[PDB]
């Protein structure tokens, strides 16, 4: 008699992630925060934007 395990998942919310460029997308996360304002990200890192001179 193989047991049927039941999934143990925590509460999840729908969060808006506003990157440093102002663009906003929706995500599914567990944190309670509503809007995550990201000041630093791939859009403001030189390694991901080598041609950008403002960050250089």
């Amino acid at each position: 008699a193989t047991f049927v395990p039941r999934h143990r998942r925590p509460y999840q919310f729908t969060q808006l992630v506003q990157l440093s460029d102002g663009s906003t997308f929706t995500v599914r996360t567990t944190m309670p925060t509503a809007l995550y304002k990201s000041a630093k990200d791939s859009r403001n890192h030189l390694l991901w934007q080598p041609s950008d001179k403002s960050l250089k």
Binding site: H7, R8, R9, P10, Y11, Q12, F13, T14, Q15, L16, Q18, G22, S23, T24, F25, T26, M31, P32, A34, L35, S51
Partner: protein
């Protein structure tokens, strides 16, 4: 003994969509339906795991939590997983709650701080609203500028050029020294300038157009490569080839401008959006 066909190498420079496609009505209703089902099967939210008791964050969460009638989520409306009225989890037709505009409204109505650092509720009139998201449709969308790359952010744009007149893509004769991928890169620089950041996908052609020879006239065998523009704008100033105008068109507007035979050959390369 002259060659019958003139080999040409062209580049179809395209700007990929910058925004996700609009969700269908079923997708919105389905997500809301599943989000509410998640309330009935996921563990309850422990505020003690994220907010310390008797702090600005805790007190601020508690006030807004009372406005949501105890629901820790902000995009599922008012629904209690437990109780005698948990069975009524299916919204009726027309429910604005399941719309995306309502989700963004509630989620942005929550990011504002309602309690100062001293634990006192900020007056409703002295509350700072958060900077709302940018609109999906830019000024070019309303203006209808076919020379802008901000237009139709939800669809792919194709760089089409006129030659002193028939609209077509940047093309040119292939020399004996360079190849197809080297020839296309040169034509793009001589046509639209070098001020655009472009990445040629590779060496394989995505489409081809054959103009059979008229027995006489020499046939044309055009092989079109595919290109991606990270940034920049096309400039026809001081172009070597006799180019007059350029415009960025969608897949729908493309068929109207280009000829039927010229379009029938390059439509196989198209994508979904």
């Amino acid at each position: 003994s002259s060659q019958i066909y003139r080999i040409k190498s062209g580049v179809i420079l395209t700007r990929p969509p910058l925004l996700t496609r609009d969700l269908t009505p079923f997708e919105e209703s389905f997500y809301f339906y599943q989000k509410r089902l998640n309330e009935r099967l996921t563990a309850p939210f422990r505020k003690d795991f994220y907010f310390k008791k008797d702090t600005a964050a805790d007190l601020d969460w508690r006030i807004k939590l009372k406005e949501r009638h105890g629901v820790p989520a902000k995009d599922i409306g008012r629904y209690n997983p437990r109780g005698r009225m948990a069975w009524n989890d299916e919204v009726l037709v027309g429910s604005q709650t399941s719309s995306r505009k309502h989700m963004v409204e509630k989620l942005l109505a929550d990011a504002e701080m309602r309690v100062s650092e001293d634990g006192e509720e900020i007056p409703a009139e002295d509350r700072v609203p958060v900077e709302k998201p940018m609109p999906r449709r830019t000024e070019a969308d309303e203006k209808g500028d076919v020379k802008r790359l901000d237009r139709a952010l939800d669809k792919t744009l194709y760089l089409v050029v006129k030659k002193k007149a028939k609209w077509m893509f940047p093309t040119g004769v292939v020399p004996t020294d360079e190849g197809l991928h080297e020839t296309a890169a040169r034509i793009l620089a001589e046509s639209a300038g070098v001020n655009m950041n472009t990445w040629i996908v590779g060496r394989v052609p995505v489409a081809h157009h054959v103009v059979r020879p008229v027995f006489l006239k020499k046939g044309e065998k055009i092989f079109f490569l595919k290109g991606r523009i990270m940034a920049g704008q096309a400039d026809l100033t001081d172009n070597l080839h006799d180019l007059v105008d350029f415009k960025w068109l969608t897949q729908e507007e493309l068929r109207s401008t280009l000829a039927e035979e010229y379009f029938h050959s390059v439509k196989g390369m198209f994508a979904e959006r």
